[PDB]
């Protein structure tokens, strides 16, 4: 558990439907959502690989489960029943515990993705933005759509805005 989902970010966004992880920007020009396509695509690829590994790894051979025995062979009806019950028990236990653990793994994976996105934007903004809680930031300067697009893209260009941020921060 990485503490992002249901942690310092309490709830999800119903209005961001084209991705799993995204940004919400609020400017003088306007407010809007923007899903992070790269992280969402990587997560989707990982989840698809997980599901395929679970599904496409059961390579079975042609078998006919079921034998007929008369009343003079009861030991073999019992042995066949023993084999069948043993296999059923093994598969039930394994499948149930397997899904139980991968569900936790998937939830932790999504939490890690959200936490990493937050850490990336935090390390990018440095001291030009204030952590106002709810797992997000308020800028110390005026960011137009170019600034927010640069933050989302991955090239914030901190020293362009450092001086005005210092002027507005040391108030």
């Amino acid at each position: 558990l990485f503490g992002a989902i249901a942690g310092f970010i309490e709830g999800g966004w119903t209005g961001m439907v084209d991705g799993w992880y995204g940004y919400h920007h609020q400017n003088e020009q306007g407010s809007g959502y923007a899903a992070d396509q790269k992280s969402t695509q990587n997560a989707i690829n990982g989840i698809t690989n997980k599901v395929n590994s679970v599904i496409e790894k059961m390579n079975t051979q042609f078998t006919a489960v079921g034998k007929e025995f008369n009343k003079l062979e009861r030991r073999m009806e019992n042995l066949n029943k023993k084999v069948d019950d043993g296999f059923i028990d093994i598969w039930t236990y394994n499948a149930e515990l397997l899904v139980l653990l991968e569900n936790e793994r998937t939830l932790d994976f999504h939490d890690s993705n959200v936490k990493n996105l937050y850490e990336k934007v935090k390390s990018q903004l440095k001291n030009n933005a204030k952590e106002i809680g709810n797992g997000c930031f308020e800028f110390y300067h005026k960011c137009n759509d170019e600034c927010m697009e640069s933050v989302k893209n991955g090239t914030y260009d901190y020293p362009k805005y450092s001086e005005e941020s210092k002027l507005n921060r040391e108030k």
Epitope: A34, A35, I44
Partner: antibody, heavy 126, light 108 residues
Amino acid sequence: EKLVESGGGLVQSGGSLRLSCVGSGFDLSDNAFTWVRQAPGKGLEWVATISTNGGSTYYADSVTGRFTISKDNSRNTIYLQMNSLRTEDTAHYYCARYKVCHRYGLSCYYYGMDRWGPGVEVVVSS
Amino acid sequence: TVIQEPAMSVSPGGTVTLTCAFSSGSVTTSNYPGWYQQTPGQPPRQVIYSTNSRPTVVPSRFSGAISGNKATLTITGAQAEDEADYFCGLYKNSANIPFGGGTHLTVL
């Protein structure tokens, strides 16, 4: 199911325009739309896109901060407001609809644009 | 960036193939190649979506494949109404679908 575009023409440099696309035959509430321009002598370039609900909006790096794409579900219209136009914005503009795909509860853009419009010619001469 | 062939020609009734490739990579089924046909004065039409899938309205002469890490559109028996510009749109992890320059198929 056709998209008809309008609102383009000759505009001075530094001006503004509001291109409009009207879709007949479907509801825009469950479709993601896009605006793509073809420059004279160049290939098609993605300009903007809007998601199914309308919350998510993406713009190209060249038109960021100057273009705004919005949706009007009541009038079945898609608006591209272009501001601070330059000489590089002269193009044939097309409005297109993303093919419906759903990956794990999300609305993707994998399959590309399925419906297109005839387009409107926009020229920006200083 | 997506690279196509500035112009190609074919005689009527002859099969032709149009290619689409990345500048610095390989094209796979995960890129979901798409082929669009643009005739002057009319809206573009998605001839092929995904690698090989085809809309019902589209004629059956059109077929799509991935060969030699390149997306390919094959027209078997090109008629006179297939004289248009063909664009290849690939998928690159985002909503910014890169488009090719365009191939002008001139049916002689």
